[PDB]
Design a protein around this ligand. Structure first.
Ligand SMILES: [Ca+2]
Ligand SMILES: [Ca+2]
Lengths: 122, 372, 122, 122
């Protein structure tokens, strides 16, 4: 499922709306595309499961990424702008705890943190 | 002397005209006036406070035209009149407190030093040991001190070790005296970075030839750091004797046992060795393997900058008006001085291999009374 | 820096606030820790450079990592939870656009998306 | 955490109060020092966790040390006085009863018991 068109709204709530479309899906993966004169939008959704090895917990991983590429103009060559998240947990673990952890991570990140994190403070 | 200086540059200029009856009734001019003014002190070698107030603009001129009966008005390549005021200020930020005290406390370089060996007390006595041993052996041959497994070769080995220690201490003293110069030891700390963003709305950009409204956004950044210089207190430095006699002594030692059997030994520089060994011994025992230090003045520098960027709102403008995007930047810098209570610190002089050279010199197994 | 304590609000803005404490700092690398009766919370932040290539543009990297460990109970062994983000963009490019990217992603994710995403949908 | 200075009251309650200075920090380790005319005060804090084993128990060890050394005088060389305590427990243990055991050990030691102990009274 997940819908047919993926919406990216740069600028958070109330921003500019961009719409992609399904292109391809293989290996439990999915891709979205949108072409433009000066740039293009990529979106990929991936799933995976680690190799079973006998007496330890077995884990499943999820990944979603947004990528933005700008075509070279004049001297400036190609360059990309990408940002993604990864989730890892157990297979039979209750989903509510993982969803709450994800909500917490989303809520902590905001434009204030992005503005601050750029300074390499640590 | 303290001077106040004002300086400016032209950022942009343009023209706007209104026609009526086919005549340019009003053709007023617009100027953007990049401005900065500074204060500084010269003629005094000591570090002085200074501050800077500085501002620039960046404007994309308007364009377009509109026509009426026998009259028009036009603002082609005309920077907006909003820049004529250009009054801007930094956003409020949390206040710092007691930066000087914290910098002075964290910056102190005092730290423990290597422990002084026991033979440093006898350090002053080495020269006569060697002189008397050599003299007695020469007078009564080498058979002396065979009961103690002692001879010519151990004596030369010990004296060579002593010269090595003397040169090492000499070089370290030279380094300390160099350090006393050029303002002493300098250290730096960082006192954090503050970042803040806000949004503003409904900024009128033009008030003639129509009206223009634009959005407004502001960015603010502040840094803060401090530096101090730690210099040895005058008179606490070690002895700084130069040394070319050791080269001569080493040259004599190269002659071997046969040379010293000849009149060569009477060429040893006993007086210099006695004087300098006594001086270094009394200095080491006076202190505890450390040099004192005192802090100079403490300075703090706090640069502050902000960006003011605009985007034209087209819903409250005449249709012919196009463009008008512009941005502005304001920067300030400061330098200020402070001082705190008196403090004294200690820094190690020599460590490990420096002091371990002569801790097991072989002549110590002979009883003192034979020498003394 | 940003401080010595970080707040994690499980379940998004719902509640259940957690306050980790700074434990270390080594070269732009920071991590906070907090022990609990049946769980441990730990966060990590990192910044770094890629290997320099003779004729390719340099890239920024930011990493923010959340993890969680649940202590073994009964016959159930040890297992972990985590969720982390990564941002990539060139050196010196405009910071505000890169901020808008990433925060667009953060706005996109929400509880319903995790509910769907955990279901291996793509 | 741990402040910029470590206060120590030698002689137990009511004694002379000194204040060591923060001087070094790395890998969960920190140390405090203060110079004095005839002696010096040294205080460091260390943490460590043992590596993971196939079938064993994972333990953690804390350490705290005070060290006191007096400079040489005449022919008498230098000597140092120090005393440090460690605590060891599993990774997921209950903190409160560990604190209770620590209180027990601290309460048992008193000036009278120190006097008896130094006399080699076993
Ligand atoms: Ca924004
Ligand atoms: Ca929830």
């Amino acid at each position: 499922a997940l819908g047919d068109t993926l919406t990216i709204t740069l600028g958070g709530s109330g921003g500019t709306a961009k719409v992609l479309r399904k292109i391809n899906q293989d290996g439990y993966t999915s891709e979205y595309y949108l072409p433009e004169t000066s740039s293009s939008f990529r979106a990929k959704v991936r799933h995976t499961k680690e190799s079973v090895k006998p007496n330890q917990v077995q884990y499943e991983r999820h990944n979603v990424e947004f990528t933005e590429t700008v075509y070279a103009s004049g001297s400036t060559p190609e360059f990309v702008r990408q940002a993604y998240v990864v989730i890892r947990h157990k297979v039979g673990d209750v989903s509510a705890t993982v969803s709450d952890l994800g909500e917490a991570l989303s809520f902590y990140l905001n434009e204030a943190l992005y503005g601050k994190l750029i300074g390499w403070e640590s | 002397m303290a001077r106040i200086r004002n300086r400016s540059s032209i950022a942009s200029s343009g023209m706007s005209t209104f026609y009526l009856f086919g005549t340019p009734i009003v053709n007023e001019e617009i100027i953007v006036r990049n401005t900065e003014w500074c204060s500084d002190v010269i003629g005094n070698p000591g570090d002085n406070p200074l501050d800077i107030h500085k501002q620039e603009w960046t404007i994309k001129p308007l364009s377009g035209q509109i026509i009426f009966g026998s009259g028009t008005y036009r603002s082609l390549q005309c920077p907006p009149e909003y820049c004529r005021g250009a009054s801007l200020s930094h956003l409020s930020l949390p206040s710092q407190s007691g930066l000087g005290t914290t910098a002075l406390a964290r910056t102190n370089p005092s730290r423990p030093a290597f422990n002084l060996p026991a033979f440093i007390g006898e350090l002053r006595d080495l020269p006569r040991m060697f002189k008397i041993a050599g003299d007695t052996m020469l007078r009564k041959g080498a058979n002396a001190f065979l009961s103690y497994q002692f001879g010519w070769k151990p004596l030369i080995s010990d004296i060579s070790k002593a010269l090595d220690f003397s040169a090492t201490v000499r070089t370290r003293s030279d380094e300390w005296h160099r350090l006393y110069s050029n303002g002493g030891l300098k250290r730096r700390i960082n006192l954090g970075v503050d970042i803040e963003q806000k949004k503003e709305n409904d900024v009128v950009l033009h008030s003639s030839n129509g009206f223009v409204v634009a959005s407004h956004t502001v960015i603010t950044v502040r840094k803060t750091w401090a530096t101090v210089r730690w210099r040895p207190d005058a008179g606490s430095l070690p002895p700084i004797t130069k040394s070319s006699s050791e080269k001569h002594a080493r040259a004599l030692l190269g002659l071997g046992v046969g040379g010293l059997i000849e009149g060569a030994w009477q060429l040893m520089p006993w007086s210099w060795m006695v004087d300098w060994f006594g001086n270094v011994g009394t200095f080491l025992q006076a202190s505890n393997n450390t040099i004192g230090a005192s802090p100079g003045l403490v300075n703090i520098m706090t640069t502050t900058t902000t960006n003011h960027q605009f985007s034209v709102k087209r819903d409250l403008s005449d249709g012919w008006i196009k463009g008008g995007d512009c941005s502005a930047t304001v920067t300030s810098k400061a330098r200020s001085q402070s001082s705190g209570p008196t403090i004294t610190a200690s820094i190690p002089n020599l460590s490990g291999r420096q002091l371990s050279i002569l801790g097991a010199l072989g002549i110590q197994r002979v009883p003192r009374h034979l020498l003394r």
